[PDB]
A paper describes a structure:
The structures show two unique mammalian V-[name] components, Ac45 and (pro)[name] (PRR) in the Vo domain.
The 3D classification enabled us to distinguish two different states. In both states of our study, subunit H is well determined in the cryo-EM map. The structural analysis shows that the ABsemi, ABclosed, and ABopen heterodimers share similar conformations in states 1 and 2. The structures of the A3B3 hexamer in the two states showed that ATP hydrolysis triggers a conformational change in the subunit DF, which further induces a shift of subunit d. The c-ring is subsequently rotated and results in a continuous proton translocation across the membrane. The structural analysis shows that the TM1 of subunit c”, Ac45, and PRR do not change their relative positions in these two states. However, they have rotated ~120o with the c-ring, suggesting that the entire c-ring including subunits c, c”, Ac45, and PRR function as a rigid domain in proton translocation.
Author numbering:
A (entry chain r): 302 to 335
B (entry chain d): 4 to 60, 67 to 281, 288 to 351
C (entry chain s): 365 to 455
D (entry chain q), I (entry chain p), K (entry chain o): 5 to 155
E (entry chain b): 2 to 204
F (entry chain c), G (entry chain g), H (entry chain k), J (entry chain l): 6 to 155
L (entry chain n): 105 to 155
The structure:
């Protein structure tokens, strides 16, 4: 009976966490050693 | 779309350089300076304009004029944040290139760094990066010092061992200016919109002056047709075809008929005012046109190339007055 | 199709399916599983299910659309604060 | 009389957005203009106390979002109806995005103002009049949110 | 561009989910599960109504504050050499401040017509009540977003007029007519906004 | 009568007729009026004459105004769903084309006045192009009125 | 009859017929109209001869208007679902290909008028490539008509 | 008979065969049409010789038009789901590979025409690469037919 | 009276977002102003203990977020209501994101201030005043979190 | 038989094998076709000799062609869901790997023909690199042939 | 008494996010400061063992995420309640993404702080004072992760 | 995250090592701290897999 509640806390959490991986992984991929 | 921004960062400085445009001497301002007869009367009419009280303390007119446009240019660079501070750095590279060739000459002939401060242009100057001040080494251990300077990426066509007298002193300026004009075109292509159609027409004609003035003076010289080919900037309207026919020229009319393929550069070959006085009036026609567009970075580079015309014209008025030869005094460039 | 739900209880708490007409009702009930079919039964077996579950319920489907509304207001405000460089030289 | 249990989410979210979006704008007014104080003070160091006028006008934007956030948090209650809770969410966006807006307006004008006031002192009364018209936009965020929260 | 890749990396991705979520609802049989009726009915008529009051004033002043800083940088920019601009060209600030008045006049009007009720069923919440809900959202949308666009309109022209008046004093009274047609769109916003809330009543 | 949610699409059509036409009148006046103050400094004679691109762009704004008056008065509590879908596309047809006309006006209205400052022979041709940009705003109006009045 | 929301697709077929053809005709007006002013300063003779791409951008605007008023005449309450999809594919195909023809006109129409100021030989070759940029919009029309009759 | 939504996919096959082929035809004409201007300013003799890239981009348009009248004439009320999904993959195959083939034409069109301007020996080689660029549009067509036969 | 199984998520997220977003502001106030200490040190190394006033006031933004983090965690129980847990969520966002903004403002004026303070030390009585106006922005997010979470 | 919706995945195996393989073969022609026109100014002798990457990229298009007809010939009304997934997995394995081989041919085909003009000893080695950049699509065949036959 | 089947996903996702996001902070703290050590060692090779204090204070941030990972993973069992499981998810974000902030701030002031040390060795006693307030942000995020996971 | 730190300081470290070999003892010492982040990856993974 808690299907929305699962899609509440599994979809937007995994994408929240997916980003803060990618935007962080982007920020270390091209750094400036110069 | 790229116009409701750019006043976040460059709102105040844009209205500043428009205010400094009004300090340019107009046509009516030019007429009263022709009527002068001595340098003291030249001092009086310039006090009526925006220049006033700058001669309170004929070759001093050369220095006291151009020192005003340096401090006006340095004041603009102190407030541009990041979208413009690199752009104003690109205008100084044309003066840093003319400075560094002046410096490798005294380096080659063992004339030390004491001659650097009074005999260089203050726009492109060396008052930071203190490694260049110490270097007296003959042009091979100094190139390793030279790369701690923003002219480093332009030296990627300058081999260090090619510097030691195998290349002429003048040739290394033009192939550095060739490396300079390709980068400043590509940097102005990375920026888009209003600064990409008001600035790049100026850089096309500036590369095409370096197409014509090179080959018209490369006739009696013993530099071959492959040397003047790579000294052409691959930038302007003449790139795929006009650069090819300029290499095989060998004659004054053979550079004219290749300019007859373009209706802009013909009717400028009717100097037959000389050619460079006809190229200068078209150049200030383009810099005046850059003042039409508003939300773009090209208003700064158009200001500097017109401010150097202001210091050029007043001296030419003064040289016709001090030498008392004012039958050619009307051969100035009336920019406004 | 056939309906199927998991809680078809009475005792309205937030969103239970059964509601009485009068609020302090004497009767209450609960179906901890459920599947009912009418009007298209074949072969003495149920058809495909129509669940009550849903990816979205109308509580999470207003709260998302307001949270996604003012995340976007934030990412306009955060974009401008993330873009004010200072100058390099001072005079 | 009793509403749904998730009804109090929106008035709480209206209380936070009244303080998040107001502080984001007021931090822009203190940073963008406060950077211009540093570039001004090297050449003209006398008008340093005179130029905290755009900074203090950005400070009123912060307390513009604070007062309404107090009035919403005092009006919170268990089991508020959906009409009551949504009235404060619309109250929060009215004061929040206005303070985020007028936080930018004091920021850019106060930056360009104190850079120009140092080279001409006559622009000071002109600069402070534009900042009045910028900061009064934050006052328009109040008297719609004060009407909405009281209703 | 670094930060633009985030929004253009999400908008392509979110549309790519909603494309393939779209050809998997029709392709099985599950279009009955979509229910745009259940989305517009079961949520609330208050979520649309109370957002419209908020977007009425807030999106107007985010054009009004946008209109100020575009020409306010150009006032003080040209004001360094020509200090006479600070008196004449303040009407460009007013026309990009009177747009904020068009919001706050409208925002009190839309909040004057919102009233509670007791129903919780979309058949009990009649079509007299749901239509009252969306109309506050739509009228709040068109007085907010249109004032945003006319706010940036008079500001950009106001920045150009501050630069043109720095060179010539007689020009500013001629370019001021352009700011009238820019600020006329703010007048065109509020006429729609009252008209969309004319026949509206909650309860 | 119609369902309870039916009036939503008529309301969204009433707003979208106004906002997208307001966006066209915004860029039509801001991008072009930047060129008008640009033109006035070097040639202050055509300043009162070249305000025709900022007044044609004003007609884009009243194009979205009339269909907003047409639709929002035709609203009622609980209209039929077929009548409301027509008013939704009535708002989009005049709005996005009025949005398209503003990008057409502001580009050629800025480009025309710069050549006018360099050579005033363009002025007969520049105003002719602004007619062709204005029928784009005009074509959106006649599709909006033939859709909403059904 | 059909479902209630069936007419929503045929309304969106009427809107996307107009707003995409208007967006195509706008860019073909804008990108070519910028090239008119750059040509007219140096060669002011060919200024009414150079407005061949801007009227050829204008024919893309009437191409959408033919399909748009055709759909609004065929709209009716309770149209079947198969009838409404056909008008959606009609307005989409005349719209987006008209947007393609509007993009194709503006690039070579600008490139043609930048070259004809430099050489009069291109003026016969410029109108050739503009025709091939115009028949793309014509191909969208003849398939819009064959999709809306059925 | 088939379901009510089945006719939507076959209509989408008719439009996507058109607009995706039109986008490739527009881009191939525009990208190579810019090179005709830069070639003409020095070598105006090879004007009629340089129309062969832009007409081979025109083949991509009629490749979409051939498939579009095939899908539109096989349309009927109540077609089966197996019938409609065949037509959707038929429209994507000619359109998207035609979008690819139109992209490959315009790149070698811009490079080859500028290349044959400096040296006319490239004209027998430039037309060779364009043939391999064109035939990718034909590979989409022949699989668009055999999907639409069944 | 008892809450549902998932109702404790938001007050957990309230204690999380109060510490995460306030730290990212406290990080930027240290990071952006820490480069300002480095360029200042090569010219005027006398103002080093004087110049750490931006980096300590950035750290106050973290302990602003710390004291509301443990205050929310002290009130956590199993089976709390939605109204009680949303109250801690909006308390968390109003102190973390407003602290994130106040952390942004200190880092910019901290960078611009200490570089001008080396070239002219008269700025230090004015630079420290703009940072107070930037810090009190963080204090505005504190007193709304305390008036939300405790009630 | 199977379900009614099963044909859509087998269609997507037939179409994406022809889109993506022709999408890579277009890029391999376009990127290397620029390299042909760049060296033809200085070195006009190697034009017939240097079109090896263009005809190697042409095999990538017929790689997608052979698996498309082999899948389309297996298409029946109401095929099983296990059979249709095998054709989608086969079509993705040949198209996207061909899109990879279209990328790898295009880069070294561009850079290699820049070097073979200045030094003709690269001509043995440049085609030797291209074999490894071509067999990647050939590995895509023997997985697509083994999957569609099951 | 017992929890549902999907409950242990959130406690596991708190265990990974405590270790991942602290390591990405420990990456940027080591990497950005590591280039400044290589930039210093060309001219001033003496401060090469003294200057590894940013890369060792960035190492503490990894150990901050380590202990809470073992704290979370040792409380795991099937039928863990949703109140207990969300506490571990609220733990791991509050130590990882806050340690990511302290990881970002250490590498910035560590890089610039060792650039000016080559031109001014007096900065070395002041640079470590800046790095303390950068590293203490991970300490605040640690103790809130413990007070959330001990429950 | 471990290979990101090894990649950056391994890049700039071997540049300065050729210009001055005194960095080589210090370059490894930072590289150990860059590598044991992955070693903390084990003792969370190994402590979770055996449950
Ligand atoms: C490109 C890659 C993306 C690829 C994506 C591929 C995903 C396709 C899988 C769909 C298959 C499911 C299916 O068969 O239908 C099912 C519906 O389920 C759905 O189709 C919809 C589920 C997703 C909607 C959630 C919002 C997405 C927003 C995304 C935003 C992201 C933004 C990120 C930035 C059938 O439903 P049912 O028969 O009623 O029974 C099950 C439902 N029940 C249990 C609840 C009752
Ligand atoms: C990352 C975190 C992402 C989190 C995504 C999860 C969002 C939904 C969470 C709870 C969903 C839920 O269960 O609904 C509940 C409340 O639902 C709400 O109203 C909560 C809305 C929270 C929005 C997120 C705030 C973030 C703020 C950011 C702003 C930045 C500035 C109510 O449940 P119900 O559905 O009404 O009851 C029906 C019963 N049934 C479900 C059994 C049928
Ligand atoms: C699911 C699938 C998702 C895949 C989607 C897209 C994949 C592609 C992703 C690329 C993104 C790169 C962004 C980036 O470069 O860093 C950005 C920082 O960004 C931030 O400041 C943080 C933003 C917070 C977002 C939180 C999401 C979750 C919210 C709940 C900006 O970088 P920068 O430091 O400003 O430097 C830019 C250089 N420049 C200034 C010259 C322009
Ligand atoms: C990259 C992105 C790819 C990742 C995607 C991941 C999605 C995987 C989730 C599938 C899980 C089961 C979903 C499902 O309903 O099964 C269904 C199978 O249908 C499929 O499973 C087809 C999968 C659709 C994927 C489409 C991607 C193709 C892109 C090219 C079975 O449906 P059913 O149970 O028979 O109910 C229907 C009954 N009814 C017809 C009576 C209504
Ligand atoms: C990227 C974006 C991905 C996110 C997209 C979509 C996410 C949507 C997932 C919705 C799951 C619904 C199923 C559900 O109700 O709970 C189920 C649990 O299932 C889970 O909770 C597993 C959580 C999945 C996250 C894994 C992503 C990691 C991929 C990273 C790879 C790198 C059921 O649990 P239960 O205890 O058995 O309850 C009894 C139910 N029963 C009676 C039916 C048996």
């Amino acid at each position: 009976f808690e299907y929305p509640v699962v899609f509440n806390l599994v979809l937007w959490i995994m994408i929240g966490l997916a980003l803060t991986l990618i935007v962080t992984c982007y920020n270390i991929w091209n750094m400036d050693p110069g | 779309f790229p116009e409701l921004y750019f006043n976040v960062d460059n709102g105040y400085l844009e209205g500043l350089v428009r205010g400094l445009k009004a300090g340019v001497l107009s046509q009516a301002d030019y007429l009263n300076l022709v009527q002068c007869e001595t340098l003291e009367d030249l001092k009086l009419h310039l006090q009526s304009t925006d220049y006033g009280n700058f001669l309170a303390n004929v070759s001093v007119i050369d220095d006291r004029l151009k020192e005003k446009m340096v401090v006006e240019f340095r004041h603009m660079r102190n407030h541009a944040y990041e979208p413009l501070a690199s752009f104003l750095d690109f205008i100084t590279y044309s003066y840093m290139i003319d400075n560094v060739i002046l410096l490798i000459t005294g380096t080659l002939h063992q004339r030390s760094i004491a001659e650097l401060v009074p005999k260089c242009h203050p726009l492109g100057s060396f008052e930071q990066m203190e490694a260049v001040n110490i270097a007296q080494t003959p042009a091979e251990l100094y190139n390793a010092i030279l790369v701690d300077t923003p002219l480093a990426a332009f030296f990627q066509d300058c081999i260090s061992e090619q510097d030691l007298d195998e290349m002429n002193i003048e040739i290394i300026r033009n192939t550095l200016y060739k490396a300079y004009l390709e980068s400043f075109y590509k940097f102005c292509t990375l920026l888009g919109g209003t600064t990409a159609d008001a600035m790049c027409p100026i850089l096309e004609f500036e590369a095409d002056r370096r197409a014509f003035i090179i080959t018209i003076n490369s006739f009696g010289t013993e530099l071959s047709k492959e040397d003047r080919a790579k000294l052409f900037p691959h930038c302007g309207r003449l790139y795929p075809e006009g650069l090819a026919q300029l290499a095989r020229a060998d004659d004054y009319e053979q550079v004219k008929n290749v300019a007859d393929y373009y209706p802009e550069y013909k009717l400028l070959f009717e100097g037959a005012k000389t050619l460079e006085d006809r190229f200068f009036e078209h150049e200030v026609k383009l810099n005046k046109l850059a003042f039409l567009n508003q939300f773009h970075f090209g208003v700064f580079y158009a200001f500097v190339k017109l401010k150097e015309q202001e210091c050029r014209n007043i001296v030419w008025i003064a040289e016709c007055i001090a030498q008392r030869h004012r039958a050619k005094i009307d051969n100035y460039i009336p920019i406004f | 199709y056939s309906f199927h739900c998991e809680h078809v209880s009475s005792e309205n708490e937030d969103g239970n399916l059964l509601v009485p007409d009068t609020q302090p009702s004497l009767w209450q009930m609960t179906f901890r599983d459920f599947q009912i079919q009418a009007f298209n039964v074949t072969d003495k077996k149920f058809s495909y299910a129509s669940d009550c579950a849903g990816f979205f319920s109308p509580g999470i489907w207003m709260g998302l659309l307001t949270s996604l509304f003012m995340l976007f207001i934030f990412t306009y405000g955060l974009h401008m604060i993330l873009s004010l460089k200072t100058m390099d030289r001072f005079d | 009389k009793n509403g749904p249990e998730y009804a109090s989410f929106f008035a709480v979210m209206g209380a936070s957005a009244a303080m998040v979006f107001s502080a984001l704008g007021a931090a822009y007014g203190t940073a963008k203009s406060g950077t211009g104080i540093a570039a001004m003070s090297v050449m003209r160091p006398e008008m340093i106390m005179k130029s905290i006028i755009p900074v203090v006008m950005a400070g009123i934007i912060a307390i513009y979002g604070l007062v309404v956030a107090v009035l919403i948090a005092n009006s919170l209650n268990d089991g508020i109806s959906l009409y009551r809770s949504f009235l404060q969410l619309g109250a929060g966006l009215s004061v929040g995005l206005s303070g985020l807006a007028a936080g930018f307006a004091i920021g850019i004008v106060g930056d360009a103002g104190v850079r120009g006031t140092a080279q001409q002192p006559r622009l000071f009364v002109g600069m402070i009049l534009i900042l009045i018209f910028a900061e009064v936009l934050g006052l328009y965020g109040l008297i719609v949110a004060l009407i909405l929260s009281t209703k | 561009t670094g930060l633009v890749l985030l929004y253009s990396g999400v908008f392509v991705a979110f549309w790519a989910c909603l494309l393939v979520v779209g050809i998997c609802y029709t392709i099985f049989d599950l279009g009955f599960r979509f229910d745009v009726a259940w989305f517009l009915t079961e949520t609330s008529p208050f979520m649309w109504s109370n957002l419209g009051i908020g977007l009425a004033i807030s999106l107007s002043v985010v054009g009004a504050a946008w209109g100020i800083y575009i020409t306010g940088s150009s006032i003080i920019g040209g004001g360094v050499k020509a200090p006479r601009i600070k008196t004449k060209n303040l009407v460009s600030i007013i026309f990009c401040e009177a747009v904020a008045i068009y919001g706050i006049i409208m925002a009190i009007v839309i909040s004057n017509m919102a009233e509670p009720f007791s129903a919780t069923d979309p058949k009990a919440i009649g079509h007299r009540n749901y239509h009252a809900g969306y109309s506050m959202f739509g009228a709040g949308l068109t007085v907010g977003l249109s004032n945003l666009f006319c706010g940036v309109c008079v500001g950009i022209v106001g920045s150009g007029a501050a630069l043109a008046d720095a060179q010539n004093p007689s020009l500013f009274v001629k370019i001021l007519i352009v700011e009238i047609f820019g600020s006329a769109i703010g007048l065109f916003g509020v006429i729609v906004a009252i008209l969309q809330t004319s026949r509206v009543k909650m309860g």
